[PDB]
Subunit: 367 residues, 3 copies
């Protein structure tokens, strides 16, 4: 790739109580990353209908409070299986093929941006995304990219009558006859709170930052160490809040692919490749995404009082190699290999290893 | 997949003591599937000569009894390494690159239908199925599909001469100069009985079933839980025997592809995809196979008194989501969300949950 | 593959303090094996500047003595992380992404040959070899195949300024303002003795060999049982020394590709495929590389006094299946079945089983 561009969605699907936005998974960034991105927003009383995908999915909630519930095959009911609550900041984990449903109850919408790792090992189909809905007669979000009905409507009435042991009339209602997101007139009176596994860990409205710098921002990461349902996914996530003109240092992921989606405000990012080319040099704003491939190096300087972002890294234990600051790779170098690979005096080399005391987040220059 | 079809073979190879038939790997079903199917039948006194593929193999024995022996490199002998017996319903696990031979001695022929997963992490070559014979001049079963002799008959007359430490004459014998299934005139007088790992497990008719229902039939599953050599393969198999007009309810496999080879009888099968499209609506009869991709939904009604099948799943521990039955996905949903995704009333949603009290097999409708 | 051949390199770069050669990764043999070979060389007082790749690397030192550093991300300093010394006959293991530098102080020019497994599961990018130089203005070894400056020079002056917290005078030095391998004029004052695990193991002649035949030679191999860091790499290596006219028997790797680099001398190798076609017959001589795929079979007779080779296998625990020897597959086959596959008398079967008593190495034929 010669030029990474900030990408917008190219597909909106307005449902009765919501909206689904999907990004084109065949632009070379998304081809390379091997994920498909989606932003679902569901209004008051909306109930996203039960569905599943042929790959690992990890959902980040940008705003809202609802209930969500996953129908796991080998699992015990309570009537019905476990319903979890959520808040903005929560990272939801969805194992391959597991069917889920989500519902909102307040005025403030649920906006939940999320990625499908189409390129996962668990995805024994092809690199195309697919959602398999259990209900309704509607085009699945990604059918456009391939080139409607639920997985139950593609059956024969005689087959559905026999399977459920119900009469023809009710069997007709299963068989199709509002989109994926439906509005509940009366609102669900369904109780507000591996089958044992926690699949909800908050990296937004926390107060326990991985890194926290009162002069520059704060950053948090959910890896499997602290959110073990993520070893199932082999997926990760980072949330970082950045003050105006603070910066996160040049770094690269050794073992992963970052899909940086910007939640708030804006920042000027720079990403340079193996040949030293500056494959993107611009600004990333709200509701826009930048994919940063594996060993490529990104550096950002903020433009807003708090430029927030969720970076979905594809690896449940991602590793970053900081190139400037407290724990950098140049710090860990002998003071004389730096002198000869950079062509620096002994005096200077020291400054390049100690002028910035800060780990990852470096404060605003002050001018 | 546009349309799935009940595939038969496109390759008969008749040898002295038996027959090998293979199914085309370049068909779109097998290409998605990632498998290579084949069915070898050995007659009385026949010896399938030692060979090996570059991927995980899983052999099911449709009928007959005989013996088979692995030639595992890191092992102790006795004279010779271990030879095992086999009955019908035996599932033999063969690790990547291990060699083996199989012999029959009855009048009843061994019919062993098997799959090589050519899309394995273990297969480090290409998607093309191939078999490497130690002995005998003959072309390999999948030479047909690429576009001969065995591996030993390719070296120089003096390289075997030098290697085995023998003369020109028996070097010419080892050097090639009846195909893969030769008949052993008198009979192999070898006694009828990881190195220690049990590569045999009976899933067939002489088993203790997983689902059993005397009005509808029974299912039996060999995951890696119960047959531990299968976690080496990363392959599974399943046996079913449905009563006439009994059905297995619509279900999908969360994490595996299935290759349903029908062993006995006939059945009316139906599979639907992500867009509610009925990709197969027909009959799978004996000696035919139907590939059901990853999150595709499958349901079948039996048309025989006892329709029997083998289902090679491609995952050593497959999970199936049942869409109807005691433990269905719909059974674990809140009654109220079942009303709102399918447009039912409370009463009807009491029925989709409770009209069928059965797990996986549902009895004949009984009219 | 139709035919194989002994390959010499196509690309060579003269750097100030040494040289770098790279084999073309887009040959059909290299696309099949899935690896990229480079042979670098450090003359005296040379530093190889910090670099890193999107894949698991395994460097084998052919000749010389020197030291090297590995800049691991999480790892603790000492002033800087822990340095290791290498001497010839060594194998150094470099995890995906880890940056490393390499120095030479003797006159004796360090020659190391190495692979990058671009087909790894850690390699999330594509099938391209690509080195990320941490400093200096030079075009990367592999760029040519793709068709410069470092990851630091592509960045902006003020981004580098603010990043490192420096003055603009040393930020411009730092911004790249003598190639990969640069001569330290005085030569480093730096000493000569997962953050603590061993990443060096010696498989040269100094080592205790696995096989030692005083008339034939010796074979030493490092798996992840004896060099555990290689389980990270999912790679291994194997050194071989063979007297004139001796032979390593016909054999096949069950689970790995093989990259034979001819260190010293010249032998005559034969590799035959699954059809019986001798896809290579002729001589692999010094500084040349023969790729030998997964279940393909190889035999070789040494034509020099002591032909020396390193075999880069693509598996940390490769299993080999030898075709003639003490330990052979034929040995484990009952005398009777080996009579019938090869068409031999009983007494001619015992000759195959017993004449050659040596494991892997068979002496000269004695003429």
């Amino acid at each position: 790739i010669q030029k990474l561009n900030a990408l917008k969605p190219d597909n909106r699907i307005e449902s009765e109580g919501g909206l689904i936005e999907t990004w084109n998974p065949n632009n070379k960034p998304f081809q390379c990353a091997g994920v498909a991105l989606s932003r679902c927003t569901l209004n008051r009383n909306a109930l996203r209908r039960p569905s599943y995908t042929n790959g690992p999915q990890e959902i980040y909630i940008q705003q809202g409070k609802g209930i969500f519930g996953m129908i796991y095959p080998g699992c015990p009911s309570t009537r019905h299986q476990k319903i979890y609550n959520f808040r903005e900041g929560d990272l939801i984990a969805v194992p391959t093929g597991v069917a889920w449903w989500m519902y909102n109850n307040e005025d403030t919408p649920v906006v939940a941006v999320s990625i499908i790792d189409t390129n996962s090992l668990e995805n024994q189909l092809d690199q195309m995304p697919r959602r398999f809905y259990l209900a309704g007669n509607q085009e699945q979000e990604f059918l456009k990219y391939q080139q409607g009905g639920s997985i139950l409507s593609g059956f024969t009435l005689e087959f559905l009558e026999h399977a459920f042991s119900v009469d023809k009339q009710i069997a007709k209602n299963l068989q199709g006859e509002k989109g994926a997101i439906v509005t509940v007139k009366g609102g669900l009176s369904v109780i507000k709170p591996i089958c044992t596994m926690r699949l909800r860990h908050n990296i937004g409205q926390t107060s326990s930052p991985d890194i926290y710098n009162p002069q520059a921002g704060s950053v948090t990461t959910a890896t499997s160490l602290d959110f073990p349902a993520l070893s199932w996914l082999r997926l990760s996530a980072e949330f970082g809040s950045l003050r105006k003109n603070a910066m996160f240092v040049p770094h690269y992921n050794l073992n992963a692919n970052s899909i940086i989606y910007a939640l708030n405000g804006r920042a000027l990012i720079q990403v340079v490749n193996c040949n030293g080319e500056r494959v993107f040099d611009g600004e990333l704003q709200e509701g826009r995404v930048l994919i940063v491939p594996q060993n490529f190096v990104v550096a950002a300087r903020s433009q807003s009082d708090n430029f927030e972002y969720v970076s979905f890294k594809t690896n449940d234990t991602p590793m970053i190699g900081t190139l400037a600051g407290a724990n950098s790779l140049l710090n860990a170098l002998p003071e004389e290999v730096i002198q000869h690979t950079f062509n620096l005096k002994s005096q200077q080399a020291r400054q390049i290893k100690n002028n910035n005391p800060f780990k990852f987040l470096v404060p605003p220059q002050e001018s």
